[PDB]
Every structure is written in C-alpha cells, then in structure tokens.
Amino acid sequence: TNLCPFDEVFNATRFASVYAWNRKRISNCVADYSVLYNLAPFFTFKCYGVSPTKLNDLCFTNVYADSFVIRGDEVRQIAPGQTGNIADYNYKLPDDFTGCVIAWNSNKLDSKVSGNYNYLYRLFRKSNLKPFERDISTEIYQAGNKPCNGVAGFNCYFPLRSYSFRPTYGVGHQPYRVVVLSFELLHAPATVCGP
Amino acid sequence: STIEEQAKTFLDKFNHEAEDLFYQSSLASWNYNTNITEENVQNMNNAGDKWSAFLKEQSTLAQMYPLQEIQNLTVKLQLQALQQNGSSVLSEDKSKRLNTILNTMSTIYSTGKVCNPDNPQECLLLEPGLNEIMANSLDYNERLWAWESWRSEVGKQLRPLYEEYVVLKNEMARANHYEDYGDYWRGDYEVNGVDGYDYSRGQLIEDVEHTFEEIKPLYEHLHAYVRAKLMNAYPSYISPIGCLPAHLLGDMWGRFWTNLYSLTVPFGQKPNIDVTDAMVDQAWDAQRIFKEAEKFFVSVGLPNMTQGFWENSMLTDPGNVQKAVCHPTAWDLGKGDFRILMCTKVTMDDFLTAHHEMGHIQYDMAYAAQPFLLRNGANEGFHEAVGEIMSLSAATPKHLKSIGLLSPDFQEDNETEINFLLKQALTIVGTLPFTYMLEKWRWMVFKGEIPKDQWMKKWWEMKREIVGVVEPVPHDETYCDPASLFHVSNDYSFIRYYTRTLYQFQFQEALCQAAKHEGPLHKCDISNSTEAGQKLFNMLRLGKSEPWTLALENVVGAKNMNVRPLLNYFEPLFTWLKDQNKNSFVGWSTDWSPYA
Ligand SMILES: *[C@@H]1O[C@H](CO)[C@@H](O[C@@H]2O[C@H](CO)[C@@H](O)[C@H](O)[C@H]2NC(C)=O)[C@H](O)[C@H]1NC(C)=O
Numbered sequence: 001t002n003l004c005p006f007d008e009v010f011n012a013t014r015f016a017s018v019y020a021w022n023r024k025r026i027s028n029c030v031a032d033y034s035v036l037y038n039l040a041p042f043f044t045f046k047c048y049g050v051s052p053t054k055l056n057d058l059c060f061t062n063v064y065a066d067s068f069v070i071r072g073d074e075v076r077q078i079a080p081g082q083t084g085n086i087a088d089y090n091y092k093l094p095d096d097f098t099g100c101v102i103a104w105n106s107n108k109l110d111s112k113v114s115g116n117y118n119y120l121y122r123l124f125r126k127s128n129l130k131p132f133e134r135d136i137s138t139e140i141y142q143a144g145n146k147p148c149n150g151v152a153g154f155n156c157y158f159p160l161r162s163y164s165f166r167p168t169y170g171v172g173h174q175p176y177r178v179v180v181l182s183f184e185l186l187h188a189p190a191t192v193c194g195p
Numbered sequence: 196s197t198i199e200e201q202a203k204t205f206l207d208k209f210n211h212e213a214e215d216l217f218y219q220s221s222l223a224s225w226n227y228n229t230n231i232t233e234e235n236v237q238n239m240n241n242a243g244d245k246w247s248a249f250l251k252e253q254s255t256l257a258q259m260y261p262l263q264e265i266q267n268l269t270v271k272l273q274l275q276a277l278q279q280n281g282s283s284v285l286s287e288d289k290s291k292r293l294n295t296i297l298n299t300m301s302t303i304y305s306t307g308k309v310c311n312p313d314n315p316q317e318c319l320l321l322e323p324g325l326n327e328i329m330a331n332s333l334d335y336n337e338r339l340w341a342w343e344s345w346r347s348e349v350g351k352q353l354r355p356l357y358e359e360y361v362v363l364k365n366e367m368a369r370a371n372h373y374e375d376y377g378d379y380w381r382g383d384y385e386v387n388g389v390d391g392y393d394y395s396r397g398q399l400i401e402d403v404e405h406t407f408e409e410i411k412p413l414y415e416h417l418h419a420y421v422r423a424k425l426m427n428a429y430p431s432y433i434s435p436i437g438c439l440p441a442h443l444l445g446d447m448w449g450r451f452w453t454n455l456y457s458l459t460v461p462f463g464q465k466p467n468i469d470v471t472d473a474m475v476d477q478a479w480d481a482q483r484i485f486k487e488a489e490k491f492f493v494s495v496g497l498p499n500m501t502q503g504f505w506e507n508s509m510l511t512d513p514g515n516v517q518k519a520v521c522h523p524t525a526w527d528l529g530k531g532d533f534r535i536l537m538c539t540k541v542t543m544d545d546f547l548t549a550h551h552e553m554g555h556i557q558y559d560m561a562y563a564a565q566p567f568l569l570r571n572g573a574n575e576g577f578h579e580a581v582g583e584i585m586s587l588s589a590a591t592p593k594h595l596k597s598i599g600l601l602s603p604d605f606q607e608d609n610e611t612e613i614n615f616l617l618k619q620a621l622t623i624v625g626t627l628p629f630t631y632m633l634e635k636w637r638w639m640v641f642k643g644e645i646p647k648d649q650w651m652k653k654w655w656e657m658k659r660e661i662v663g664v665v666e667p668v669p670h671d672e673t674y675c676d677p678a679s680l681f682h683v684s685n686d687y688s689f690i691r692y693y694t695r696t697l698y699q700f701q702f703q704e705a706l707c708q709a710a711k712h713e714g715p716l717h718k719c720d721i722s723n724s725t726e727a728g729q730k731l732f733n734m735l736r737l738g739k740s741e742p743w744t745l746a747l748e749n750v751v752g753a754k755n756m757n758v759r760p761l762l763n764y765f766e767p768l769f770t771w772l773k774d775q776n777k778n779s780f781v782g783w784s785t786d787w788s789p790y791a
Pocket residue numbers: 494593594597720722723
C-alpha cells in the first residue's frame with residue numbers, strides 16, 4: 001500500500017503564480033482518486049477524455065499535477081480550445097487534452113485587507129504559448145518601434161502585473177486555487193493505477 | 196505596428212491600473228461616509244489625491260495619440276474620454292484662481308446664515324432652519340421676509356465671483372475648441388462617426404424648445420388651477436390676470452410645487468394611499484423591505500443580489516456614537532462590490548426609496564463587463580430615469596395588494612386617481628418650465644447675447660412668460676438671485692433634470708407594452724413580465740459603448756426624446772383640469788406685479 005501524496009498538492013500551505021505554475025511528477029503509486037472531496041464546496045471538478053464516474057481502474061505510466069492560483073472569472077479558461085490572457089500568455093492546454101481540472105475557492109486564505117500582491121500574471125507577450133509551455137522571462141515588452149533598452153517608458157511596459165486580492169471583492173474577483181491532473185500512457189510498464 | 200495596436204495596449208494597462216486605484220479610492224470614501232472620523236478624512240483625501248494624480252498623468256500620456264487614425268469607434272471613445280485636457284489648458288494661476296473661486300462659492304452657500312431682525316443670535320441655515328419655514332409655514336410675511344433676506348444676503352457676495360466664474364469658464368470653453376461653456380455642457384449628448392445616429396450640439400436646444408412648446412398647454416391649465424386655489428387661500432395678494440408670487444410656490448425658489456398639495460387638494464375627504472401603518476402592524480423592518488424589493492426585481496427576470504451586498508452594506512442607522520451621513524446613495528466600488536447607504540425608517544417613502552436605489556444598483560451591475568472608461572449611462576439622463584421607473588411601478592395599488600400590504604377590500608374610485616394624478620403633476624409638471632427657463636438663461640448668459648448690466652433686467656421677463664412667476668420685490672443688478680440655487684452655485688449642469696423627465700415616461704409605456712397592460716397607463720405594473728425585463732436588460736447591459744440614440748431606440752424604437760408618453764400619462768388629469776377651468780381665465784399677464 002504505497003500511497004503517494006496528493007496531500008502535498010491539494011493541501012499545500014502556499015500555491016504558485018499562474019505564470020510560474022508548479023508542475024509535479026507522480027509515479028510508482030497507488031492512485032486513489034476516490035477520496036478527494038475534502039475541500040470547502042469545491043466548485044469545479046471536470047475531466048476531459050477520461051470519465052470521472054469511477055474510471056480510476058486504469059493503469060497510467062505517469063501523472064502530472066500542475067498547481068496555480070487565478071481569479072474566479074478565468075477558471076473557464078483552463079480548458080481545451082479557450083482564448084484569453086491566461087489561455088494564451090500564461091498557461092495553455094492542448095486541444096486533445098486528457099485529464100482532470102479541479103478548482104476551488106480560496107478567499108479565506110489568499111485574501112488580505114491591505115491587498116495580496118504576491119500573485120502575479122503575464123499581461124503582454126509577443127506570441128501565444130504552445131501547449132504545456134512555461135515562460136518566466138521578465139524582459140520588458142516592446143509595443144512601439146523604438147528599442148526599450150530595459151527601461152520602462154513610452155510603449156515599453158513591464159509584462160507582469162499583480163492580482164491584488166482583497167476579502168471584499170466579488171465572487172468573480174476572488175482567488176481560486178486550480179490543480180490540473182494530466183495522465184500519460186506510454187510504451188512502458190505503466191505502474192500507476194492502484195486498487 | 197500601427198497606432199491602433201499601441202492604443203489598445205495602453206488602454207489595457209490603463210484599465211488595470213485605474214480599476215485598482217479607483218477601487219481603493221471608493222473604499223476609502225465609503226469608510227469615511229459610514230464613519231465620520233478625522234483619520235477617515237485624511238485617508239479619503241490621500242486616496243483622492245492619488246487617484247487624481249494618476250488620472251492626470253495618464254491623460255497627459257494618452258494625449259500623445261492623435262485621434263484621427265483609430266478606427267473601430269470603441270478605442271476612439273475611450274481615448275476621447277481619457278484625453279479631456281480640461282481646466283489644465285489655461286495657466287496654473289488661472290486654474291488656482293478658479294479653484295479658489297469655486298471653493299468660496301461652496302463655502303458661502305454651505306455657511307449662509309440668515310439672522311432674524313432685532314436679534315442677531317437666532318440665525319438659521321438652509322437645513323433644517325429655513326427649509327422647514329419655506330415648506331411648512333403658510334404666513335405671507337415670514338415667507339416674504341425669508342425670500343428677501345436670502346436674495347439680499349447671499350447673492351450680492353456671489354455676484355462678482357459669478358462674473359469672474361463666467362468669464363474664465365468662457366475662456367476655458369474657447370480654449371477647448373468650443374463656442375461657449377454652454378456648448379461644452381451640451382457636448383455630452385453629441386454623437387459622431389455613426390451613420391443614422393449623429394447628434395449635434397445645436398440640436399438639443401431645438402428639441403428642448405420643441406418639446407416645451409407642446410408641454411405648455413397642460414402646465415398653463417395647471418397654473419390656472421393653482422392660481423384659483425391660491426386665490427381661495429390668499430384673496431388679497433393675487434391678481435385675476437397677474438402671475439403667481441415668487442414666495443407662494445411651496446419652497447424657497449419655486450422649483451417644486453408639491454408643498455401646495457395640502458392647500459390645493461380637490462377632494463380632501465378621500466385619504467391617500469398610505470401603508471406605513473400596515474407595515475407597522477406586520478412589524479416590517481428594513482431587511483424585510485429590501486427582501487421585498489429584491490423579490491420584485493427578480494420577478495421581472497433580473498438576477499439575484501451578491502452576498503457581499505447583504506454583508507457589507509449598511510441598511511440601518513447606527514445611532515449611538517457612530518455618526519454617518521443619512522443621504523440614501525448606491526455605491527459601486529468596482530470589482531464586484533455593490534453597496535447601499537441608507538438610514539431606513541418604517542415609511543412608504545423609504546419603501547419606494549429602496550426600490551429606487553435597488554434599480555440604481557441593478558443598472559450598475561448590468562454593465563460591469565464593459566471596459567473601465569465605458570461603465571456609465573449612455574448619457575446623464577438614463578441612469579436616474581431607470582432608477583425612477585421602478586419606483587413608479589412599485590407604488591401602484593395593484594402591487595401593494597399583491598404583497599399583502601393593502602387590504603383586498605380596497606376598491607379604487609376615480610377620486611383617488613384624480614388626487615394621485617394631481618399630486619404627481621405638482622412635482623413633475625411644475626419643474627419643467629423652471630428647468631427650461633434656468634437652462635435657457637444660463638445658455639444666453641454664457642453665449643453673450645445677454646449683456647452684463649442687463650442680466651437681471653432680462654432675468655425677470657422669462658419668469659413672467661415661461662414659468663409665469665412675478666417677483667414680490669424688485670431687484671437691481673446688486674442682487675444675484677440665480678446663485679441662491681445649489682446647482683448653479685456649485686457649477687452643475689441643470690438640463691439633466693429635463694431630459695430625464697421625458698425619458699422615464701418613454702420607457703414605462705414601452706415596458707408596459709411588453710407586459711400587455713390594459714387600461715390607464717398610470718395604473719400599470721411591470722411585475723411578472725420577464726419579456727419586459729429582457730427588453731430593459733438589453734439596453735442596461737450596453738453602458739457607454741453605444742450612442743444614447745441607439746440605446747433609446749433599442750427600447751422605445753425612437754432615436755429622439757419624445758413627450759407624447761408624458762402627455763398620455765396625464766390625459767385623464769388633463770380632461771379634469773379642462774372641465775374644472777372651463778369657467779376660469781386661461782393664461783397670465785406679464786405686466787402686473789404684487790408691489791405695483
Ligand atoms: C406575480 O407572480 C407571483 C407568483 O406567480 C404572484 O404571487 C402569487 O399571487 C397569487 C395571486 O392570488 C397568490 O394567490 C399567491 O399566494 C402569490 N404567491 C405565490 C404563488 O407564491 C404575484 O401576485 C404576481 N403579481 C402580479 C402583480 O401579477
């Protein structure tokens with residue numbers, strides 16, 4: 001009975017930014033997806049490709065858990081074939097994605113009266129993101145025709161901005177924690193299902 | 196990259212930063228208004244200064260994008276709203292001079308003390324001292340004394356300040372590519388760049404005068420009736436063909452005529468509909484009233500209210516140590532934060548005020564998805580009109596009986612409808628000639644058609660020909676009678692009170708048309724009419740993105756302000772006034788004066 005920790009993923013004391021989402025590899029496991037309903041009314045639990053209805057009895061080579069925090073309005077953008085700031089510049093899912101997406105509200109933890117500026121996101125970029133790609137570069141975006149020279153100014157903006165969460169915000173502006181589980185089947189012994 | 200992409204990127208940045216800063220400023224202002232402490236004062240001042248500095252810096256930065264090369268008519272609207280060079284065009288000396296002048300105007304108006312003769316200690320302010328005197332006291336001498344004292348003590352100090360204000364505002368208007376300050380004020384309704392919906396700044400004057408020409412007969416018949424009733428009340432002070440005296444109009448300036456209702460009721464033996472005792476019997480409280488309002492708004496298909504609205508808004512007076520301004524307002528702090536500040540009492544007036552601010556909140560929630568610079572009403576009249584139509588609909592006897600407030604054994608008889616229509620006309624119809632006269636006089640003053648030394652010389656011919664009011668005491672150039680009003684002394688436009696009146700009646704007839712109402716329009720109700728709710732929401736969701744002509748056509752099918760619904764609203768009242776005044780002279784004379 002080797003149970004690898006989804007507790008270090010779902011119950012982490014702190015999550016990551018959407019532009020710097022955390023990826024974790026999980027293998028050699030007894031994967032128990034049956035007991036995951038231990039969160040405060042978790043609004044979103046949607047699986048694509050694999051049926052959520054007790055289809056946990058299938059053996060996978062590896063699992064990836066990707067964790068980040070967004071606001072309530074962009075939770076719809078974590079899905080195949082979606083367009084937006086998060087879907088294009090921060091975190092992109094493939095059109096043929098197979099896996100699950102779990103999103104739950106986090107107002108009681110991530111919100112502060114004076115504002116929570118820790119969480120950031122990317123607002124400007126030259127081109128969209130390839131599926132499952134990450135960008136961390138902080139080079140300032142160039143909108144005009146003159147060189148930026150690494151200094152903010154006219155038509156030269158810092159690509160990263162902050163959410164600045166507060167407890168008095170609306171439901172659509174409140175923080176939401178998102179975990180994406182991605183399943184692979186490869187040419188390998190595929191030793192991650194678990195009874 | 197073209198200029199349009201640069202403008203789009205800059206607007207995205209401005210939307211983000213302005214949203215954050217505006218939310219902070221609004222939250223600080225709300226904390227001050229709900230809790231009057233000096234620390235809250237300093238926090239509000241700091242937040243306002245930061246927001247103003249950010250807005251000025253962003254306007255200066257956006258000035259570098261010329262308007263001509265931006266298509267799509269949406270980025271152009273935001274750039275126009277952002278540039279707004281304003282008073283900063285003139286020299287800093289003139290800017291600080293105008294700031295000081297307006298500050299002195301506000302200080303003089305707010306701290307105006309009127310002291311009774313023979314005792315320079317029993318001095319009174321506008322509120323609640325002289326307001327109660329001019330709204331409740333029926334004594335001729337006291338009202339005349341208050342009228343003369345206010346027009347003599349306050350206006351004379353403001354006269355040179357008003358002249359300098361007018362001159363420098365004309366300078367700003369000429370510096371901002373406008374004909375005059377009146378043109379700058381009228382520029383709100385201007386629409387450009389859309390075929391079939393263009394509106395010109397000069398068209399507003401033509402529309403207003405055209406509508407007032409059609410309104411005139413009903414107001415004239417009402418004036419004759421009020422003159423007859425005042426004669427029955429004051430036989431020794433009104434001429435058979437002369438105009439009504441200024442200080443017998445129910446309030447300080449004659450803007451509203453509601454205070455004469457107790458004097459001008461035709462059938463005093465039939466009490467009006469007052470359900471305050473009914474709410475007392477069922478022990479209704481403020482939260483119950485707001486739940487009823489939310490139920491009414493849901494019945495037409497409009498959505499719920501956010502939980503933050505119930506958690507954060509202060510619906511009752513806190514009393515004790517916590518002091519706050521009890522002026523009922525609706526606050527849209529941004530980022531999904533909507534609140535209502537109201538000192539609710541158990542009174543039908545507060546019952547209607549709840550619906551009024553609930554409609555304001557619904558309108559604010561409608562366009563929350565628009566960009567930051569496009570979250571307003573299509574013009575300055577739609578917002579309050581949408582607020583007013585819900586209050587009009589909620590006050591009908593049918594709705595009161597539907598919620599159990601009125602006993603089912605209440606049968607309507609035409610005496611009650613006549614009284615209700617007269618009460619409504621004493622407020623709505625009475626203020627239209629005053630609004631038109633004041634706006635036309637200010638437009639002429641700013642335009643320069645009215646010479647300086649003949650300001651007041653002109654001011655009193657319109658009062659006799661437009662609103663039919665004659666002064667009790669002649670006033671020379673020393674007095675400044677107009678500045679005694681709050682709006683002109685604080686430099687606010689006054690035409691928004693006219694168009695709104697002609698909007699709230701165009702909506703209702705359309706809305707009642709969706710509910711298939713049968714019978715008189717004044718007994719309509721839009722409850723349980725989800726079709727009407729969708730029809731109204733289709734316009735509420737637009738915001739400032741589309742021209743106001745298109746928004747108006749979306750609901751009523753017309754691109755221009757129309758007055759036919761307003762006259763259709765008062766048709767039985769019009770017939771009753773015609774029947775009553777068939778045996779009385781119709782019109783007035785501009786030569787008679789109470790002072791001879
Ligand atoms: C709007 O619709 C509601 C619900 O359809 C009406 O409320 C009911 O009205 C009937 C009419 O006699 C009562 O018998 C019920 O007790 C009411 N409450 C219910 C069904 O929960 C309401 O009267 C309607 N209002 C208007 C103006 O049509």
